Design a protein around this ligand. Structure first.
Ligand SMILES: O=C(O)CNC(=O)C(=O)O
Ligand SMILES: [Mg+2]
Ligand code: NI
Ligand SMILES: [Zn+2]
Length: 331
């Protein structure tokens, strides 16, 4: 069995290997990459996403979200308070302000220490989940707006044509902006390209051990767990690496820098934080190997998770027994 310790693998595809996206995902899996839940892909030196980032300031962040924490430093939830619209230029200035800017630090490990010590005492503002793309239309390799769609994959594998669309999303971050512990909708893959700016640190639990994280989470957030049998779908709970280690939860960590891709694999729980002002693009995707995970994915039906239009067909076709309850949670 390849990668039996479930380490995060880093790949350096050549320009030739960068042509065929599906083929390379399958290659990474042949080497055991998916066992970690997360892989990093460093693009060949010949590749670029676009020519420059000099002209992005006028993008609108219609609903910036202030991420307010509750709990203790290593075990907390966050809620998202909606703020007034602002441009990316305005958001960048805010991120760089004394109130929000990254503190002085020695290295990534020092900044990680500072994150986990102090995150809860601040409320950073995240420009998350903005439909759009920063890839140039002429970028033919690993262009996240040009991937094969999940509806087409489902139709190819299973024969059923379904409604729905699959487009990318932009994320504008600042110091301490946080992504809570989650797997993707329907336990899909995700891919995330860090276009510009400061790094993103990731934590990940191997898919084969995801239920260990779920059991810890139920213990640590006992009210939330009574409320919903899949409350991590709410995407609000944080647990620090120190707490995970104290509880024997297998995990790994890695820092993504600008110009690098990360892929999350089906049922790979992940969480993390941004180091300073940055912009990432991400999308969900599927492969043949996903279908079995999609059939078994948990679902939130309590009303909280509320998701895209396109998840309806995935539930309907892959989880017909669950569909009526889930759709009620949508309504
Ligand atoms: O970058 C973020 O805030 C969160 N991203 C992801 O969870 C992802 O790409 O799957
Ligand atoms: Mg612009
Ligand atoms: Ni994710
Ligand atoms: Zn729920």
């Amino acid at each position: 069995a390849q990668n039996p310790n479930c380490n995060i693998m880093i790949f350096h595809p050549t320009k030739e290997e960068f042509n065929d996206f599906d083929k390379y995902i399958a290659y990474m899996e042949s080497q055991g990459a998916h066992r970690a839940g997360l892989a990093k892909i460093i693009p060949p030196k010949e590749w670029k996403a676009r020519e420059t980032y000099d002209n992005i300031s006028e993008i609108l962040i219609a609903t910036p979200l202030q991420q307010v924490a509750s709990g203790r430093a290593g075990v907390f939830t966050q809620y998202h308070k909606k703020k007034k619209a602002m441009t990316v230029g305005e958001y960048r200035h805010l991120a760089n302000s004394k109130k929000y800017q990254t503190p002085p630090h020695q290295n990534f490990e020092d900044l990680e220490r500072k994150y986990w010590k102090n995150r809860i005492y601040n409320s950073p503002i995240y420009g998350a989940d903005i439909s759009g793309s920063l890839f140039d239309e002429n970028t033919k390799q690993w262009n996240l707006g040009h991937l094969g769609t999940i509806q087409d994959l489902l139709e190819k594998e299973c024969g059923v044509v379904i409604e729905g669309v699959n487009t990318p999303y932009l994320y504008f971050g600042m110091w301490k902006t946080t992504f809570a512990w989650h797997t993707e909708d329907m336990d899909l893959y995700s891919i995330n390209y860090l276009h510009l700016g400061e790094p993103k640190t990731w934590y990940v639990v191997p898919p084969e051990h995801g239920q260990r994280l779920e059991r810890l989470a139920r213990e640590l957030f006992p009210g939330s767990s009574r409320g919903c049998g899949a409350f991590l779908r709410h995407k609000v709970a944080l647990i620090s690496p120190t707490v995970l280690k104290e509880n024997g939860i297998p995990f790994n960590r890695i820092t993504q820098e600008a110009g690098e891709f990360m892929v999350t694999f089906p049922y790979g729980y992940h969480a993390g934080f941004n180091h300073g002002f940055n912009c990432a693009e991400a999308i969900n995707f599927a492969t043949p190997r996903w279908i079995d995970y999609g059939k078994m994915a948990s679902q939130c039906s309590c009303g909280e998770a509320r998701v895209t239009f396109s998840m309806d067909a995935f539930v309907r076709i892959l989880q017909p027994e669950r569909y009526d309850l889930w759709k009620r949670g949508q309504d």
